[PDB]
Structure 1
């Protein structure tokens, strides 16, 4: 729904020092390397201030804390605690903004959802009939579309397709037009591709419904 793409746009539009780390990158072995990596990330933001830290897929290492009974969960909880300490601790970092992207928003630790660490909890919902039109218009603005291709008949369908699904519908329609050696995407290709990205069920098992 554009969580990563908005951070990409911010990185393209920032005068600060963008520092992207993925949540899975902090899960390194050799205990004392993950929290140390968090310490290095925040320190690196500190000297090259102003700087922005984008931590994508934080649900990997920022799940709600619990009574860990092995070094496995103890280390990931330690990474979460190091994140909490470096984002808001005894050393207040100035001019160091943090963007953090998750797909769950409820497994997150309550200390990390504090309005002193993650102030703005922006929600990226599935595009509606209005946002889908804009997403189609922006993706297809570069694509070579036939005049008979009216985008409205696809944005008015009630299927809850995401922005990634919209981009899929566009790219695969262009791919299908390419396959037939045609340099213009026709409405037939759009309709054919529209059926292959919204039939996500496919397999199922017919008894869960």
Structure 2
């Protein structure tokens, strides 16, 4: 038998009641970051033909990095709240499982479910859990995580320009990331979320107060 593509997926999409209550207006002073995410995640999802006519190759993935507390995860909450596309939320630590092969398996269910429910956004918070540049071949942890990362690279390589799936990865330790994850075609857009400037500070102060 052949099962439906949306079937056999331990990872589920975001339901309407799981949508975070965080708005874009809730976030204060991240116009550069908001613009880049919009131009690289939500605008290609709705304007894929305008990219093709102009000639821009839309970034398959987006890496959001910066010091902790600078709006990485929250922007994903706002994107998930303000999107008409499917949102598949995950954190890299869940991929590491006791049952060997279940990690690489549940990586391809995320991408298979996203492909079947296109347009879709894959958000993988704390990507350092499965994207560390060091691997010990005599340890089952690093052997399995190597399989998870290799599948993750294979899945993004397996997406052509026709499939309308965007991947978002967030990390505050991008120095520890494997350079293969940042290659073109996998994460072509690295957005930095730095510490707020003085102008950024007054917008964050105004939005919370």
TM class by smaller structure:
0.5 to 0.7
Answer yes or no: is 1:64 the counterpart of 2:124. Answer: no
Q: 1:85 aligns with which of 133, 137, 154?
A: 154
8 Å contact from structure 1 (residues 84, 112) kept in 2 = yes
8 Å contact from structure 2 (residues 135, 143) kept in 1 = no
Answer yes or no: is 1:125 the counterpart of 2:162. Answer: no
> What root-mean-square deviation, in Å, do the aligned CA atoms of Structure 1 and Structure 2 show?
1.3
- Measure the CA separation in 2 of the matches of 1:62 and 1:4: 18
Unaligned runs of 5+ residues in structure 2 are 1-69
- Measure the CA separation in 2 of the matches of 1:111 and 1:65: 12
Deviations 1:60-103 (A, max 9, x none): 111114352222210011111111111113x5371010010011
Answer yes or no: is 1:104 the counterpart of 2:173. Answer: yes
Matched with 2:113 is 44
Matched with 1:10 is 79
Deviations 1:184-204 (A, max 9, x none): xxxxxxxxxxxxxxxxxxxxx
Unaligned runs of 5+ residues in structure 1 are 141-209
TM-score (norm 1): 0.64
Matched with 2:63 is none
Deviations 1:21-50 (A, max 9, x none): 111111111011111110111100011111
Consecutive aligned runs of 4 or more in structure 1 exceeding 6 Å deviation: none
TM-score (norm 2): 0.64
8 Å contact from structure 1 (residues 65, 77) kept in 2 = no
- Measure the CA separation in 2 of the matches of 1:39 and 1:65: 23
